[PDB]
Amino acid sequence: NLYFQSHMNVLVIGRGGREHAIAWKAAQSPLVGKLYVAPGNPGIADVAELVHIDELDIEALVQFAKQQAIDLTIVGPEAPLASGIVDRFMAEGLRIFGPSQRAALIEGSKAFAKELMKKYGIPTADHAAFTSYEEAKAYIEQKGAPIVIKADGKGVTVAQTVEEALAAAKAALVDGQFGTAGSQVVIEEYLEGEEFSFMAFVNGEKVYPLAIAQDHKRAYDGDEGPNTGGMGAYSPVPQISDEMMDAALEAILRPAAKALAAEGRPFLGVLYAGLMATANGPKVIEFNARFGDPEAQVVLPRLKTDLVEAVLAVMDGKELELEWTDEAVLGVVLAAKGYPGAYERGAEIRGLDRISPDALLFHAGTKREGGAWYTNGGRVLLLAAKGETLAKAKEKAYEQLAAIDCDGLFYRRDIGRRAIE
């Protein structure tokens, strides 16, 4: 079907498991000649050449890319995007998949995203910020309870009653941090239902849906403890109906891409909708402007289509249908004890050699030294397995995980548990 230029040098920006997953996929493309990741990490060195340049060193990255004749740059994390790498690259004539600074604002500013979804009729949790008690009060009292109250400067209360919400909102203003605008309180609609991650390739108004993943954000078994970058994920997600999926594509993803374009911020890249499946249909929690982590590690193994060709087709504004395997994929994050708090580095990791070769081991935060492996970051590794069903992928993933010994790491035993229940 689609022809593109073969023997294309590709650069991936980032250092994590998402970027291990995007490099591992890229390396399998019949289109790719040379594959660099800047800065990557020692498990990524197995699939790609590492480049010792920071993600935020935009001028070095531009100079590296001109000089090593990079045909495609794919940006992993959001900070480079929020800093204008795409803008710099385009002005230099370098081809890049990722949003402009102005488009990436959809993730950077939750206020801006709320503002855009309100103006364009996009379903989401109601959101409002106040520096006045009396105005906070009058608003809490129209909206009623349960209600989220958020204090700046733990400070998140899901107030079960109106009286509690007011007590919490009053405290937020009296004890929260005094910014240059005074103290402020954030009030949000509480939503119930099942969370899901809906990513799509986007170029302007053109939206190309990926598979649907579910992430597990809480640190501990039974969705306990604080929130994290994500402790595991799987795809597909059988308890989210096709109808909910289509509602979210037509009432959320397609209108956000339009809204960004209508505001003179067209988006190019991965638009990642963090969603709730409510009784009333799907509702935005947040938007992200790039692949989710650990969502990329579980979605990208299911993609049949060549990843580099799909990116090029998207950048060209070409027609494309993405093809996916029937097999489910589930992934478990091993994190350094203490994460998402203060965590210890430098614990020896044994047993990486013992893992079956069809297991997918995505390095996020490891170091290699004197021929051994050590923890070096909050999320350290993700192990995913494929399975004919979700339960089989769950079984495979956990069985393989147990080959790893590290007294400095922990992981959730309940990834996927509800979905199989």
Ligand X SMILES: Nc1ncnc2c1ncn2[C@@H]1O[C@H](COP(=O)(O)O)[C@@H](O)[C@H]1O
The least distance separating ligand X from the CB of residue 16, rounded to whole angstroms, comes to 18
The least distance separating ligand X from the CB of residue 365, rounded to whole angstroms, comes to 20
d(CA 97, CA 305): 17
**Residue 260, token pair as written in the block:** 């960004």
Footprint on residues 76-95 left by ligand X (CB under 6 A):
none
195 belongs to an annotated ligand binding site? yes
The least distance separating ligand X from the CB of residue 191, rounded to whole angstroms, comes to 4
In three-state secondary structure terms, 173 is helix
308 close to 143: Cβ distance less than 8 angstroms: no
Q: Which is nearer to ligand X, 50 or 285 (CB)?
A: 285
The least distance separating ligand X from the CB of residue 284, rounded to whole angstroms, comes to 9
**Binding string, residues 114-153; x marks residues near ligand X by CB under 6 A:** -----------x----------------------x-----
Sequence-ordered list of residues with C-beta below 8 angstroms from that of 280, at least 6 positions apart, any chain: 123
DSSP string for residues in 117-146: HHHHT--B--EEEES-HHHHHHHHHHH-SS
The least distance separating ligand X from the CB of residue 126, rounded to whole angstroms, comes to 9
**Residue 308, token pair as written in the block:** 């580099």
Place of tokens 């203490």: 338
Q: Which is nearer to ligand X, 6 or 227 (CB)?
A: 227
d(CA 61, CA 46): 21
Q: Kindly indicate which of the ranges 28-36, 188-196, 260-268, 299-307 contains the residues binding ligand X, using the contact rule CB under 6 A.
A: 188-196
100 close to 268: Cβ distance less than 8 angstroms: yes
The least distance separating ligand X from the CB of residue 111, rounded to whole angstroms, comes to 12
**Binding string, residues 267-306; x marks residues near ligand X by CB under 6 A:** -------x-x--------xx--------------------
Q: Which is nearer to ligand X, 164 or 286 (CB)?
A: 286
141 belongs to an annotated ligand binding site? no
Q: Kindly indicate which of the ranges 187-195, 248-256, 313-321, 411-419 contains the residues binding ligand X, using the contact rule CB under 6 A.
A: 187-195
d(CA 212, CA 322): 13
Q: What is the CA radius of gyration of the chain?
A: 22
The least distance separating ligand X from the CB of residue 103, rounded to whole angstroms, comes to 19
Applying CB under 6 A, among 195, 205, 395, 414 the residue interacting with ligand X is: 195
d(CA 206, CA 314): 8
Peptide bond just before 238 cis, omega within 30 deg? no
Q: Which is nearer to ligand X, 13 or 199 (CB)?
A: 199
Applying CB under 6 A, among 160, 177, 227, 280 the residue interacting with ligand X is: 227
Amino acid found at 402: A
The least distance separating ligand X from the CB of residue 298, rounded to whole angstroms, comes to 16
From its phi and psi, is residue 91 left (phi > 0), alpha (psi between -120 and 50) or beta? alpha
**Residue 276, token pair as written in the block:** 């709730």
Q: Which is nearer to ligand X, 195 or 395 (CB)?
A: 195
The least distance separating ligand X from the CB of residue 141, rounded to whole angstroms, comes to 19
d(CA 51, CA 70): 13
Could you count the other beta carbons within 10 Å of the beta carbon of residue 315?
17
Q: Which is nearer to ligand X, 113 or 380 (CB)?
A: 113
Could you count the other beta carbons within 10 Å of the beta carbon of residue 387?
17
Could you count the other beta carbons within 10 Å of the beta carbon of residue 74?
25
Place of tokens 């979210």: 248
Applying CB under 6 A, among 78, 107, 188, 309 the residue interacting with ligand X is: 188
The least distance separating ligand X from the CB of residue 175, rounded to whole angstroms, comes to 20
Q: Which is nearer to ligand X, 2 or 156 (CB)?
A: 156
Q: Which is nearer to ligand X, 378 or 408 (CB)?
A: 378
Give the strand pairing for 379-387 and 232-235: unpaired
Q: Which is nearer to ligand X, 110 or 254 (CB)?
A: 110
DSSP at 390? H
**Binding string, residues 251-270; x marks residues near ligand X by CB under 6 A:** --------------------
Q: Which is nearer to ligand X, 74 or 148 (CB)?
A: 148
Applying CB under 6 A, among 70, 117, 191, 233 the residue interacting with ligand X is: 191
**Residue 159, token pair as written in the block:** 């107030």
DSSP at 56? T
d(CA 358, CA 348): 24
State the number of binding residues for ligand X (CB under 6 A): 11
In the complex, the residues that contact ligand X under the rule CB under 6 A are 125, 148, 188, 191, 195, 217, 227, 274, 276, 285-286
Residues of each annotated binding site for AMP: 189, 191, 195
Residues of each annotated binding site: 189, 191, 195
